[PDB]
């Protein structure tokens, strides 16, 4: 998190807002509802209260505007600038303006008025932008998903550095961005994409370019809005430019940011039985045309080139890959080595000598 220079903050806990005008994109009640919900994100974790006035001057004046709308900071039409807000203070301070050239919804489409508003109000209360990509106060918008909204840990720590905690946090466990340098880190899925490593953890992925030591951290929704936050497994088809992504019994095929026609498919179409609930890990080999699909303590080998499961699967991981334990969290390969992730360790496996040759921490893939 970051706070404002001179640490601008309100000197009172009892704050008033007023909705000066309304977007036509939603009904007054729906808009009153979004803003109320936006103020509660902050009131739930602080001593702050928010009271709505119907006339006069409030601390937080809320308005919708298009292009030049009064202050000399004009909006820009569809997309781009979504809204803006002033830090705590008289007059303009604490105020928030929304670009009505956006289509404001209470849904996943357009731009979600509650989501932008919560962010805006963070400014109104004294939070600057955050560098944490998982943080509400991140400078760039992402629709967070269809599940109920939890305010991320960074924003909570930020806001509480100004105002302290409330009496009762209704949701005390706040989502924390994963720490690449934590030796207990375990991974959800790994793949390549255009040369670069993709490492999935919760609702994030790091992308790591081989000429780089520091991995870029992304929200998975920022690449693929129509995919799950958390994923089970991932593999690639280098030539073809294709990523495959698993979550429960569904899988996607992805060509950059595009979900191919006819996905998601059911993993049964891949020829898995009904009692397989998830693919825990997966890896594809370019030269042979075969994919490995892990689940529980077993492996399937699928032939991508003839679209059938190879004969004599499933087999046991214990039997084909001795010495890596009983499960496979995530798996990728390079230069004739397969890297098996199992909790906080990774087993480097030699296809060549058919044995483990090096054992190293999982998070070691992130130059930690």
């Amino acid at each position: 998190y970051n706070v404002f220079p001179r640490t601008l903050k309100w000197s009172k806990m009892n704050l008033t807002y007023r909705i000066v005008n309304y977007t036509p994109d939603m009904t007054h009640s729906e808009v009153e509802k979004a803003f109320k919900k936006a103020f509660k994100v902050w009131s739930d974790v602080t001593p702050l209260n928010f009271t709505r006035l119907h006339d006069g001057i409030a601390d937080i004046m809320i308005s919708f505007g298009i292009k030049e709308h009064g202050d000399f900071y004009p909006f820009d039409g569809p997309s781009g600038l979504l809204a803006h807000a002033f830090p705590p203070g008289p007059n303009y301070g604490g105020d928030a303006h929304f670009d009505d050239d956006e289509t404001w919804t209470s849904s996943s489409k357009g731009y979600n008025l509650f989501l932008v508003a919560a962010h805006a109000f963070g400014h109104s209360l004294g939070l600057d932008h955050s560098k944490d990509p998982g943080a509400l106060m991140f400078p760039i918008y992402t629709y967070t998903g269809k599940s109920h909204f939890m305010l991320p840990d960074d924003d909570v720590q930020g806001i509480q550095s100004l105002y302290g905690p409330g009496d009762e946090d209704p949701n005390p466990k706040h989502p924390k961005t994963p720490d690449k340098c934590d030796p207990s880190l375990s991974l959800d899925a790994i793949t390549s994409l255009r040369g670069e490593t993709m490492i999935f953890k919760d609702r994030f992925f790091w992308r790591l370019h081989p000429q780089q030591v520091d991995a870029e951290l992304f929200l998975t929704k920022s690449f693929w809005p129509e995919l799950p936050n958390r994923i089970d497994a991932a593999y690639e088809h280098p030539s073809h430019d294709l990523i495959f992504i698993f979550r429960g019994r569904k899988f996607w095929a992805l060509n950059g940011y595009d979900i191919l026609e006819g996905y998601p498919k059911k993993i049964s179409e891949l020829g898995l039985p009904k009692e397989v609930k998830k693919i825990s890990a997966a890896v594809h080999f370019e030269d042979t045309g075969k994919t490995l699909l892990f689940s529980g303590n077993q492996v399937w080998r699928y032939d991508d080139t003839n679209h059938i499961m190879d004969k004599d699967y499933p087999r046991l991981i214990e039997e084909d890959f001795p010495g890596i334990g009983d499960k496979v969290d995530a798996v990728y390969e390079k230069n004739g080595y397969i890297y098996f992730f199992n909790g906080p360790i990774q087993f480097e496996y030699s296809i060549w000598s058919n044995r483990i040759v090096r054992v190293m921490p999982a998070n070691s893939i992130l130059w930690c």
Partner: peptide
Amino acid sequence: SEEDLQFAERYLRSYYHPT
């Protein structure tokens, strides 16, 4: 004077999404 008042108007913050 009003050095102290303008302070909020500098730190105006926008929220962005690319086109």
